[PDB]
Amino acid sequence: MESADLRALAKHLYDSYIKSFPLTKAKARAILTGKTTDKSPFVIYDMNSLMMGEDKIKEVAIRIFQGCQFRSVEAVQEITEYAKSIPGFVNLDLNDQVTLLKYGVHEIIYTMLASLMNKDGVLISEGQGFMTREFLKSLRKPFGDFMEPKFEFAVKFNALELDDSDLAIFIAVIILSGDRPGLLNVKPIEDIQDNLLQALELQLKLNHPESSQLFAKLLQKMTDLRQIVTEHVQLLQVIKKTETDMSLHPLLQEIYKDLY
Numbered sequence: 573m574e575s576a577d578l579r580a581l582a583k584h585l586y587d588s589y590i591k592s593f594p595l596t597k598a599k600a601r602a603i604l605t606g607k608t609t610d611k612s613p614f615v616i617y618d619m620n621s622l623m624m625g626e627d628k629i630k631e632v633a634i635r636i637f638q639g640c641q642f643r644s645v646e647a648v649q650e651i652t653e654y655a656k657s658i659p660g661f662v663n664l665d666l667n668d669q670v671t672l673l674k675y676g677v678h679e680i681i682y683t684m685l686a687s688l689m690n691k692d693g694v695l696i697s698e699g700q701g702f703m704t705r706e707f708l709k710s711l712r713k714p715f716g717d718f719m720e721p722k723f724e725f726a727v728k729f730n731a732l733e734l735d736d737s738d739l740a741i742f743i744a745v746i747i748l749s750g751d752r753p754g755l756l757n758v759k760p761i762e763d764i765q766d767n768l769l770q771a772l773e774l775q776l777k778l779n780h781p782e783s784s785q786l787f788a789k790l791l792q793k794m795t796d797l798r799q800i801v802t803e804h805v806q807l808l809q810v811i812k813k814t815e816t817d818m819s820l821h822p823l824l825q826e827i828y829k830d831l832y
């Protein structure tokens with residue numbers, strides 16, 4: 573592939589990213605930085621602002637937990653529409669299409685969640701709301717611990733200053749991982765990724781000409797993602813055993829089942 577083919581690849585992906593994901597990083601920043609008559613978010617930071625904010629969105633710790641859970645489900649669906657647009661993806665063995673999605677979605681979710689965070693909190697309900705880090709970090713024991721690692725990652729990730737056109741390619745690379753467990757046919761998957769990587773390399777050099785080794789720095793970020801996944805699964809382990817009256821959405825149950 574030559575540059576003209578990689579630019580066309582990048583352009584294709586940006587396009588579908590826009591079509592698959594209603595709340596982009598660009599909309600998210602414009603809402604966050606008060607750069608807007610894009611009517612600012614309602615801000616939840618305690619149980620009152622929460623109950624009152626519930627005019628446009630069990631115990632509180634749980635209700636918030638359920639919220640993020642349903643949001644994850646919606647995300648999985650969006651991420652799935654996006655993957656189908658990735659050239660070559662729907663031509664792969666079906667069991668593998670499933671494997672890539674099974675392992676790729678959460679790494680993606682936390683990647684994109686970064687887009688909706690600053691050091692102080694996270695956008696919610698399609699940007700209509702904003703929930704502070706401290707309110708979350710404060711939730712009763714186990715639930716207070718869910719979001720904090722995501723914030724730490726987001727603060728370091730957001731430092732990269734990626735824009736949506738950078739992220740469309742990076743997210744595609746994450747999905748087309750040859751090293752996922754149980755993969756039947758690794759080679760066709762690596763040939764695609766290889767193109768995606770070539771494409772990302774060129775996109776970053778062109779979009780961030782001054783940012784040296786951004787590419788390398790970006791790929792290194794993939795390490796922080798797998799750990800976030802790990803800790804998260806361990807937390808769920810705990811809930812399943814402590815809160816026997818609660819349960820995961822079946823789509824999320826299937827993703828987590830026999831995962832790592």
Ligand SMILES: COc1ccc2[nH]cc(CCC(=O)O)c2c1
Nearest residue numbers: 636637640641644715718719824
């Ligand atoms: C405070 O509870 C929280 C916070 C942040 C969260 N991010 C994802 C989930 C649960 C859904 C899933 O595992 O995909 C989650 C729960």
